[PDB]
Amino acid sequence: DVNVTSNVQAITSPQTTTIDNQTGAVTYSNWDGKVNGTVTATYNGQSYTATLNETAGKENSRVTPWYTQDGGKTWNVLKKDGGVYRLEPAGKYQLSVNNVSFNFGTANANKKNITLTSSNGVQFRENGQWKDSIKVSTDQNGAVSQPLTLLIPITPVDVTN
Ligand code: NA
């Protein structure tokens, strides 16, 4: 059993401060978010960093941000605005990335039906759905045999908090 945890953090900062002079209230706007961190897997007591495909071809790993306007019934691709990503604090966002792997080492070679799960909301693409678990195999080197597509949740933390 593998526990896939996310350490992906989103830090967001306001470019504009507004003061309503009828009340004195301060309002922050024009958010400028930046995502950082990694996804780690814990297996048999050791931790492994998710890897991304960096080739020129089609299998190159693609990081795509998503935002919902409702509670989660509609998601769309978060496009840049003013050359930045407008991540609003406490806003529901998700990251999708394809062709992820793990290198579990030669001690974990030729294992079959290893169960991937997550303790903080990471989901795995398979059969057109997002699932909370998936089975994978390792090759002769201990690397996961098939490319993995993850959905990584992120809640941006307000730097002004
Ligand atoms: Na005033």
UniProtKB/TrEMBL annotation:
Residues 1-160 form the S-layer protein N-terminal domain. This is S-layer. It comes from Lactobacillus amylovorus (strain GRL 1112). The chain holds residues 50 to 210 of 456 of the full protein.
